[PDB]
Amino acid sequence: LVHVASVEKGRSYEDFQKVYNAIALKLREDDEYDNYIGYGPVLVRLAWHISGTWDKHDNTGGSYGGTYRFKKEFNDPSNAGLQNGFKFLEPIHKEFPWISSGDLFSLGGVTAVQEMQGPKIPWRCGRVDTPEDTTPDNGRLPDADKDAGYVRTFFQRLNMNDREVVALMGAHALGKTHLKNSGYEGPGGAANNVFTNEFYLNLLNEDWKLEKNDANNEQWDSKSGYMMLPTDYSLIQDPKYLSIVKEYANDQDKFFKDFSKAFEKLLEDGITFPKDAPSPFIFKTLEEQGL
Numbered sequence: 001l002v003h004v005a006s007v008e009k010g011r012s013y014e015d016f017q018k019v020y021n022a023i024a025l026k027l028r029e030d031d032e033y034d035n036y037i038g039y040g041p042v043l044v045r046l047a048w049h050i051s052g053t054w055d056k057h058d059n060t061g062g063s064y065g066g067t068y069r070f071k072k073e074f075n076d077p078s079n080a081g082l083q084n085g086f087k088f089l090e091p092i093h094k095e096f097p098w099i100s101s102g103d104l105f106s107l108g109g110v111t112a113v114q115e116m117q118g119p120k121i122p123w124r125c126g127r128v129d130t131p132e133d134t135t136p137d138n139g140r141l142p143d144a145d146k147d148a149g150y151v152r153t154f155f156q157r158l159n160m161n162d163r164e165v166v167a168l169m170g171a172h173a174l175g176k177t178h179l180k181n182s183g184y185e186g187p188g189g190a191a192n193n194v195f196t197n198e199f200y201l202n203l204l205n206e207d208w209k210l211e212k213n214d215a216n217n218e219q220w221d222s223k224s225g226y227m228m229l230p231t232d233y234s235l236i237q238d239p240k241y242l243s244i245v246k247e248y249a250n251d252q253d254k255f256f257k258d259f260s261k262a263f264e265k266l267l268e269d270g271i272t273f274p275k276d277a278p279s280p281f282i283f284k285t286l287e288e289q290g291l
């Protein structure tokens with residue numbers, strides 16, 4: 001496969017900035033979801049799960065085809081709970097029927113991070129919806145019950161190296177795990193709907209205790225009321241990953257700069273951009289626009 005980026009016919013920066021402004025205004029408004037966490041966390045988890053099916057060996061999966069819209073990917077056990085992020089974005093797709101599904105699912109993630117006080121993420125338009133038979137089979141998304149060796153081997157299929165993997169995993173400060181979705185339960189820190197380096201600081205400063213939860217799965221619990229997954233806890237058990245965790249814990253700006261670069265790379269894997277294509281757009285936040 002080659003997947004060439006094609007701009008939605010006739011659309012420019014200001015059209016996309018209107019879809020972003022509409023996702024951000026609805027984030028402001030539906031602030032009660034999941035005990036007042038808001039939809040920001042499930043929207044960046046939707047943007048990474050539609051991108052994480054990519055396989056570098058044959059160019060299949062990835063964000064291009066917007067295939068989550070199909071039953072097979074939608075009903076994938078690893079995608080339980082993302083139906084909430086889909087339902088949120090659906091009125092917005094009726095308001096802007098011209099934007100592709102992959103472009104909308106991925107911009108939902110960019111909007112959520114920037115509106116949660118994260119770094120600016122450059123975003124590129126051009127994904128094209130593809131047929132139901134291009135939909136990737138289930139089982140390409142990662143297990144939580146595993147170690148640092150599995151994590152490194154997994155992220156190599158998306159050719160993400162160590163620093164990219166540690167920066168990307170910093171998004172687990174956001175939101176929480178839910179027992180009925182994944183068999184895990186609990187938050188990862190205090191500020192779980194503001195984007196900060198808190199995941200790293202909690203992983204270095206809490207007194208973590210291994211326990212089984214109500215689903216019979218193990219997780220790392222702390223006195224404070226926080227939890228970490230086995231794969232999260234892996235980042236301080238591996239010596240290469242641990243020097244990077246310490247770097248981000250001492251420097252949130254370096255974390256922002258590296259998360260920005262890696263999240264964009266994750267959203268654009270498997271897509272060729274012609275050089276006639278527009279440069280990546282930097283969207284303004286509501287606040288920047290006075291809205």
Ligand code: HEM
Nearest residue numbers: 041042045048081142143144168171175176177178181182
């Ligand atoms: C080895 C990698 C990863 C594994 C095994 C993993 C696993 C999980 C699991 C089990 C949950 C809880 C789901 C639930 O019960 O609702 C979760 C939540 C979440 N994940 Fe990951 N994750 C990984 C990588 C990432 C990456 C790379 C991102 C983002 C760049 C990400 C973002 C999120 C977000 C934001 C949540 C919170 C969702 C919410 O509050 O509803 N994860 N993850």
